[PDB]
Each structure stands twice: as structure tokens, then as C-alpha cells.
């Protein structure tokens, strides 16, 4: 539970082929992570219910500045799929940069500015 977790695919053993490096390791176990989270993401296999007590109403989603509302919930745990996916990715590209990153994926850019943005290795 709780917003901060690390949410991982669990039954995926990975056997690593020889002569890889420790970063080439990585980018294939982390590839095989990111197509398992994203499909998490694209079909909401989470394993995670959601708390009892949220039966309750509940406030409604809030508003961007820009005046665009979104959801929350959904996008919160959507988004933090897409956060763990993305943390591979970085890391993926940085170990590999002939990487190519899934097609719904979009790099990061300055855009973003809503939260704190504190790059992170």
C-alpha cells in the first residue's frame, strides 16, 4: 500500500545471456520490466486493491493552473506506472543509448514545472 512503493512484476524470472556487461545486464532485465510495467499500465494489472475505508466520498479531482482538470486517483496511479517505467527507461537509456523507449513513452522535458523537478541517478 501507500502512494511511496516501488510496484513490481512478480513471476518474471529473468536468465541472463552471457557475455553481457553489468549495464547491458540491467538493460535487458530493466526491458523486460518496462514492457511488464507498461502492461501494467495499459491494462491496469496492478494487484493492488484499493483501501476499505474509500468508500467514503471523497473531494473531486483538482484543477491544473492551466484550468484543465484530470483525474486523480486513476492518473495518480497511472502516471506512478509510468514513473516506474520511467526510472528504467533513464536508466535504460543510460546504459544503452541505441535504446529505443516504448511509443507512448515521451521523454522528459522543461514543460513539466507543476510539482518539484529534481532529477535524480
Known amino acids: ?4 512503493q516501488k510496484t513490481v512484476i512478480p513471476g518474471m524470472p529473468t536468465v541472463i545471456p552471457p557475455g553481457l556487461t553489468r ?7 530493466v526491458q523486460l520490466q518496462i ?18 475505508e ?15 482538470r484530470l483525474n486523480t486517483r486513476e492518473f495518480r496511479t497511472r502516471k506512478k506506472l509510468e514513473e516506474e517505467r ?22 522528459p522535458a522543461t514543460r513539466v514545472s507543476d510539482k518539484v523537478m529534481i532529477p535524480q541517478d
Open 54 to 68: 474509500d468508500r467514503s466520498p471523497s473531494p473531486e479531482p483538482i484543477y491544473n493552473s492551466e484550468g484543465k
Open 23 to 29: 549495464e547491458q545486464e540491467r538493460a535487458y532485465i
Open 86 to 107: 520511467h526510472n528504467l527507461i533513464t536508466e535504460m537509456v543510460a546504459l544503452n543509448p541505441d535504446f529505443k523507449p516504448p511509443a507512448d513513452y515521451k521523454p
Open 1 to 4: 500500500g501507500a502512494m511511496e
Open 35 to 52: 514492457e511488464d510495467l507498461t502492461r501494467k499500465l495499459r491494462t491496469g494489472d496492478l494487484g493492488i486493491p484499493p483501501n476499505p
